[PDB]
Design a protein around this ligand. Structure first.
Ligand SMILES: CCCCCCCCCCOc1cccc(C(=O)/C=C(\O)C(=O)O)c1
Ligand SMILES: CCCCCCCCCCOc1cccc(C(=O)/C=C(\O)C(=O)O)c1
Ligand SMILES: CCCCCCCCCCOc1cccc(C(=O)/C=C(\O)C(=O)O)c1
Lengths: 206, 210
């Protein structure tokens, strides 16, 4: 069964323009598609769902109460150290609120890049070496792994990209070494529970 | 015109191809070698700068010798990527020689993965950087993406523009990781021994259109 699904949610802009509407309308329909995918994963026993929008967190932090009632653990991945400190504190508070939740873990990428993610772990090892706490030839895959995002969760089983492009676009790199990759032309606001189940079958047929 | 400078291929389907024919596996590998020659000639004749091949055998790579002379005669530059350091001195020495012989060539650059993994590739780059930090040459905070980029396999070649995987599975299987952050990914159900010039044209024209 699929334990950790990651989604590159692309197509909101193209959807709005096909509908003859401004870019803001596609965002609002995108956010409804987020709610539906989060609900569907939580009801189908997926352990972790990681969402990359291909700031906008301001929106979310009015849904945290609902997540928390639903037993969802919320985490933001990505470089938030330059966000304003009021947002950084609201991120911190939301993560602390839900940290003890034992249902679905929802990871929201916010200023995230796969290369950045690896580089941030390398910087950490680099400090250890400079402190004299670590030998260069003791650095292996297992050790680097312990310093990249999500290393405490089930490995990513399946990556879905909506919107028609066939690229990872510097979303997760280290983590997707063994993941099933599923590409669909459906635009993110139209991506629904049947589309999600479609992807879960491609994995079931691996 | 296709716009593609560096194509990487996960060559899968040799076992399935032989099974479909009622053959033992040594036959799929032989047909797979023929398809390698064909892809290499196709790339060299269609302006691609670099072609990087991942066989998804140890006796297969050893037999290369006849092959390296044919490469050289077609002005291909050969390089092996992967961890060759626990290979026998002897193999290691024929690798160096084969590289040295062809390193002046000006046509296609052909990279062959041998004991390669994406994760390993990143790890070896990180170790090069950690050595420099330990000898006091490098500060932890000067380490950025461009710098780690300069230490992974193939950094001196054009970025990988297109990854092709034959054989039907939709995964990277710990082939390139760092290097494919922006690459076009093209999956075909065609098995590797059947993948021919028109399938390769098809993948290039798909990259051009996308
Ligand atoms: C801009 C992004 C906004 C969306 C952020 C995700 C918030 C999702 C809010 C609902 O969260 C869950 C989690 C687990 C289960 C359910 C769930 O059962 C929802 C329902 O039954 C319903 O909405 O009718 C909802
Ligand atoms: C361990 C390294 C083994 C990799 C083996 C690949 C062998 C490829 C040999 C064929 O090479 C080329 C290269 C470029 C062009 C051509 C090519 O067009 C050759 C011809 O037209 C011909 O020989 O008549 C052949
Ligand atoms: C026409 C000439 C045929 C070209 C032959 C090219 C295939 C060469 C492949 C060499 O493959 C090796 C050699 C030694 C070890 C490995 C190997 O272990 C690869 C792995 O473990 C892995 O990818 O996880 C692969």
């Amino acid at each position: 069964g699929c334990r950790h699904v990651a989604i590159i949610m692309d197509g909101n802009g193209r959807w709005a323009k096909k509908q003859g509407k401004i870019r803001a309308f596609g965002h609002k329909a995108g956010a409804k598609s987020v709610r539906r995918a989060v609900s569907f994963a939580a009801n189908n026993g997926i352990e972790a769902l990681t969402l990359y929008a291909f700031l906008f967190v301001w929106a979310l932090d009015s849904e945290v109460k609902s997540l928390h009632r639903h037993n969802v653990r919320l985490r933001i991945i990505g470089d938030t150290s330059r966000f304003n400190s009021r947002l950084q504190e609201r991120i911190r508070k939301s993560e602390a609120l839900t940290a003890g939740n034992t249902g679905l873990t929802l990871n929201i990428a916010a200023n995230y890049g796969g290369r950045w993610d690896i580089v941030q772990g390398v910087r950490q090892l680099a400090e250890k070496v400079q402190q004299g706490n670590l030998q260069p030839d003791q650095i292996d895959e297992e050790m680097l792994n312990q310093h990249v995002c999500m290393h405490e969760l089930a490995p990513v089983d399946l990556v879905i990209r909506t919107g028609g492009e066939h690229r990872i676009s510097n979303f997760l790199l280290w983590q997707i070494a063994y993941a099933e990759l599923y590409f669909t032309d459906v635009l993110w606001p139209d991506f629904d529970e049947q589309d999600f189940e479609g992807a879960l079958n491609a994995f079931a047929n691996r």
